[PDB]
Amino acid sequence: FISENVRGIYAFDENGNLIEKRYFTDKPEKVLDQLLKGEITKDLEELLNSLKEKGYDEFVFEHPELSRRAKELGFSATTEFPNIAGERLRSNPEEFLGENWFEEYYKVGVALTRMRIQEQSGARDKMVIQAIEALDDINLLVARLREWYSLHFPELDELLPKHPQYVAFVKTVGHRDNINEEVLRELGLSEEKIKKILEAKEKTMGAWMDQTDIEVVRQLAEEIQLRKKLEDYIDRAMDDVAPNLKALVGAKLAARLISLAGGLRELAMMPSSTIQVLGAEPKHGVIYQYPAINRSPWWQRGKIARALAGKLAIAARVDYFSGEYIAEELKKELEARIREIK
């Protein structure tokens, strides 16, 4: 069935004749970056519908994400690679594309890359340190909302623990008395949570307000957006500056390391030892936040931590210089030195 190329999404019968096609309405480089990744764009929905009103209930996509979001959409979707659609597209590019089909795989080949690839910048490690520094200040604002949305409603706090699930209530409703049983369902609330909140509008004490309500909602508006940004920029720009360091311990602890040392160079200049303790001095060693170090008994940690610092060092050095992605080997090497620690 469904596959993709530089021209559009194609649709194929069990035997490989062309069912329906539809060309990319928006820049290919904008669309592929989504479909390829597994996200559904307007052209992949419109073709999903017209394919249906042609009398189809079966769908097969090449990326298991596409076909998982395809069925949380309604359409029954199986996921098989390489599906006879792409096996039909690639084996016969010229059939569909034309003679210069290659040129076309390049034109758009390049375009998309120049997208995904950030322009060279003297100090992006510094841009990260910042955005990391900010994500720390927003941590405080989020902590601050807590007692607030609550002055008027103390109950919620215990009910919704997860900030993003929580800031849902404020942003959209505000006032205790803005509660619907029909907007209680929507938002993602369970049946239990459809009574734990219909018990809200009419149960518990808390000093209602009308002007305050629209002060706090203005607070949640500005809390989400600097947050995301920061988290999402800190990631997609940890890819230019220290992809090795990144894929080692996650872009955050990564960014925390760069920051903690105050730049990339600085980190690189650090021996395993200086890195095994970079983070703290009762805190002691930022890198101990590593999954495998934490889940372990203190008597074994000192050992693993050593091994981490050795690989983070390398990650830095290369990252500093070239940024050739050698994480895998090192993640491997490391996973193999730890099993011996047991």
Binding site: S3, E4, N5, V6, L32, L35, L36, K37, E62, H63, P64, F81, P82, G86, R90, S91, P93, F102, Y105, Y106, V108, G109, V110, L112, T113, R114, R116, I117, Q118, Q120, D239, D240, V241, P243, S322, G323, E324, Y325, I326, E328, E329, K332, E333, A336
Partner: protein, 227 residues
């Protein structure tokens, strides 16, 4: 003295210079376009480039005397590692404006440099991509003739196999510069290549297991054929 002749292989040339020794060289497909700090040369009007093997791991395979070098001219090839462009600039020269290359190293920081090159060297697609996740570039490649894998992954084996099952025409080939410890940092090299040639050839027709000493410790450019 500075003399330049044809090699065993198509699009491959051998040169001998003032020091009376021989060095590989490829027909640079783009005059005055120098990648990787090259040593180039010029005979009766052509700019043959020095395929220095310290820099490329194929230099080695070839200078160490490779037998089957499926990379002819015209032959489109998938390439898992295209990085700075070095060990892979040559393979554009060999292939020719009739051949093709889809190259795939995933660290943008790096790739970012090969992006200029492809302006005149319009014979490579600089795909920022990942070759552990093949599907995710099902739209910027096409069935190739030769998969060439150079990746510091530790599963080089199933990576080659899987890119293969996706984009490699029957009768196509495949070349994987395998590091030993890259696959296992605890298992003896000799014993590893026996396990690679094993797993690898459970889907392939193993053509040739070629060592790379003394250009690279425990490196070994295999050459599989897809029956």
């Amino acid at each position: 003295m500075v003399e330049v002749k044809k090699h065993k292989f198509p699009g491959v040339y051998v040169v001998i210079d003032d020091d009376g020794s021989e060095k590989i060289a490829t027909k640079n497909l783009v005059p005055g376009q120098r990648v990787y700090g090259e040593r180039v040369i010029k005979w009766e009007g052509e700019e043959y480039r020095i395929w220095n093997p310290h820099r490329s791991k194929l230099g080695a395979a070839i200078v160490n005397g490779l037998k089957n070098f499926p990379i002819k001219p015209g032959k489109s090839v998938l390439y898992l590692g295209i990085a700075s462009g070095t060990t892979a600039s040559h393979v554009s020269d060999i292939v020719g404006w009739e051949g093709k290359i889809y190259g795939i190293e995933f660290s943008p920081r790096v790739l970012r440099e090969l992006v200029p090159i492809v302006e005149e060297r319009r014979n490579i697609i600089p795909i920022l991509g990942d070759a552990t996740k093949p599907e995710e570039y099902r739209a910027l490649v096409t069935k190739v003739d030769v998969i060439f894998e150079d990746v510091a992954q530790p599963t080089q084996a199933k990576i080659l196999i899987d890119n293969a099952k996706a984009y490699l025409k029957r009768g196509g080939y495949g070349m994987i510069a395998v590091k030993s410890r890259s696959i296992d940092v605890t298992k003896e090299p000799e014993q590893v290549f026996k396990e690679v040639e094993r797993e690898l050839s459970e889907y392939f027709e193993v053509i040739e297991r070629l060592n790379l000493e003394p250009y690279e410790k425990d490196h070994a450019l295999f050459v599989v054929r897809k029956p």
